[PDB]
């Protein structure tokens, strides 16, 4: 059983990257955030929704 | 009845299947009872690394 | 203590608040609430 921990390592790795792209501003559009994170935008909304939830 | 060595086997097999069925405390306890039985075992030649 | 002015003068436990809110809004809650997907 290893893919359980890999998902825990993966969702740890998102929120570590996503807390680094908050400090330059208080207000931003999401497509630059997708461009800085180089991943996607729809998951990023679902992830940021979860971090406020 | 009598046995000691095969008891070490079935405790490990349960502590897998509680961990298979997502049981933290009881598998921890079944492992701990597996250890203290295995401590008086004269020979864990192979079962040791299984238990480890 | 009467005050000389009298002209004239169970089923639930307490359910007025839900019924003042929702009295008749299709309480089966399946046939439109679960069946929007055929409509869209």
């Amino acid at each position: 059983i290893i893919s359980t921990h890999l998902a825990k390592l993966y969702d740890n790795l998102l929120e570590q990257n996503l807390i680094r792209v908050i400090e330059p501003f208080s207000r931003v559009q999401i497509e630059h955030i997708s461009s800085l994170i180089k991943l996607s935008k729809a998951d990023v909304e679902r992830k940021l929704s979860q971090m406020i939830l | 009845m009598d046995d000691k060595a095969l008891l070490v086997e079935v405790q490990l097999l349960e502590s897998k299947t509680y961990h298979a069925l997502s049981n933290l405390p009881k598998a921890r306890a079944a492992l701990t009872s597996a250890r203290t039985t295995a401590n008086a075992i004269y020979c864990p030649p192979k079962l040791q690394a299984t238990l480890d | 203590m009467s005050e000389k002015k009298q002209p004239v003068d169970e089923d639930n436990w307490d359910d007025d608040n839900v019924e003042d809110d929702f009295s008749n809004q299709l309480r089966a809650e399946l046939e439109k609430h679960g069946y929007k997907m055929e409509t869209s």
Binding site: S49, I52 | - | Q25, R27, E29, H33, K36, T39
Partner: protein, 378 residues
């Protein structure tokens, strides 16, 4: 004698109140009717379902000759053998009384109860009688004598017992579910699931799990809720046994709202097959929907319904009218727009909300000290 008796209470309830549901409940309870010597408490279930059937005088003479054989026993016992308190007379008297609960009606049982209660000097016997009052008081859903004997049990019996009361923890919440107390007392003392054996003191265990999972989503929003329902283990395995319930939990937690309605529809339809679901099937649905909207409208000040039209479910005018009912219900502190298509919420920033509470309670107390002031001083 009162061991398979909660199931009977469902089959009476399942057959009586819905008329369309009358196919198999008449098939299995009729077998339960002709067995168990249930000869008092079936007249309504015979007058509300079918016309009549002759097996009646056959069972009447058997219960009478048995009762008379039981009547001739304990009178000879109290005429030959002189021991009182808790003796051979006593376990005759409860065996009459349990014969009264299983076979006869409640009235002969409760007068045999109050008769044999005054012939008790121990505490376990007095605990046993109050176990019997509460068991039959739930069977006939009597909300009168439960108000007494529970207070009688907790104050006068349960100061010497030790872990004999988890059963009466479970019976209290069971009354709270058929009452309106389905909010925070119901989930709090359902939190300890450390009994699985099913007995006179303990009902069906899977059904106990389904009740304690359905009620533990109303008490508490997410104040590390997930520690008690997900990080638990003994609750987790039995919901790991049940695919429907486990799907319902992860849909609510991980915010899978699309399947969430489908899980909610299965529950409410299954909720009809219950004997205590009456203050639920008009309350539990809308409370979860307004809880689902509460956490979704959280973290979005300028949410649009154009994202609700595919991520949440389908439809547009249905979500609009349901939000328009819920705002006008008085809850969900948000505003909806139509022609900008922006569900723009207004959450108070923890200073208005403190101020809104303090201005209500101060007005409610100033009323209370006015109304007190006018009663006094003539």
């Amino acid at each position: 004698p009162k061991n398979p008796d909660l199931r009977i209470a469902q089959l009476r309830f399942l057959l009586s109140l819905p008329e369309h549901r009358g196919d198999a409940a008449v098939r299995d309870e009729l077998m339960a009717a002709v067995r168990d010597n249930n000869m008092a408490p079936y007249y309504e279930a015979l007058c509300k379902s079918l016309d009549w059937q002759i097996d009646v005088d056959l069972l009447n003479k058997m219960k009478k000759a048995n009762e008379d054989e039981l009547k001739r026993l304990d009178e000879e016992l109290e005429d030959a053998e002189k021991n009182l308190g808790e003796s051979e007379i006593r376990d005759a008297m409860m065996a009459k009384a349990e014969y009264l609960c299983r076979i006869g009606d409640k009235e002969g049982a409760l007068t045999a109860f109050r008769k044999t209660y005054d012939k008790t000097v121990a505490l376990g016997h007095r605990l046993d009688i109050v176990f019997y009052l509460l068991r039959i008081g739930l069977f006939y859903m009597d909300n009168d004598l439960i108000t007494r004997n529970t207070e009688k049990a907790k104050s006068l019996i349960e100061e010497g017992g030790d872990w004999d009361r988890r059963n009466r923890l479970k019976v209290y919440q069971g009354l709270y579910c058929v009452a309106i107390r389905d909010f925070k007392q119901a989930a709090e003392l359902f939190l300890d699931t450390v009994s699985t054996f099913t007995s006179y003191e303990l009902m069906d265990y899977k059904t106990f799990v389904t009740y304690t999972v359905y009620v533990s989503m109303i008490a508490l929003e997410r104040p590390d809720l997930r520690e008690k329902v997900i990080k638990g283990a003994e609750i987790l395995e039995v919901l790991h046994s049940l695919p429907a319930v486990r799907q319902y939990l992860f849909s609510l937690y991980e915010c899978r709202y699309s399947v969430f309605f489908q899980s909610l529809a299965v529950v409410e339809q299954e909720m009809k097959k219950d004997w205590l679901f009456a203050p639920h099937y008009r309350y539990y649905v809308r409370e979860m929907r307004i809880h689902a909207y509460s956490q979704l409208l959280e973290s979005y000040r300028s949410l649009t319904l154009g994202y609700m039209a595919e991520a949440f479910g389908v439809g547009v005018e249905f979500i609009d009218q349901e939000l328009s009912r819920f705002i006008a219900a008085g809850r969900l502190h948000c505003k909806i727009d139509k022609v900008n298509e922006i569900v723009e919420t207004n959450r108070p920033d923890s200073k208005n909300w403190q101020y809104q509470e303090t201005i209500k309670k101060g007005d409610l107390l100033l009323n209370r000290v006015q109304k007190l002031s006018r009663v006094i001083n003539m």
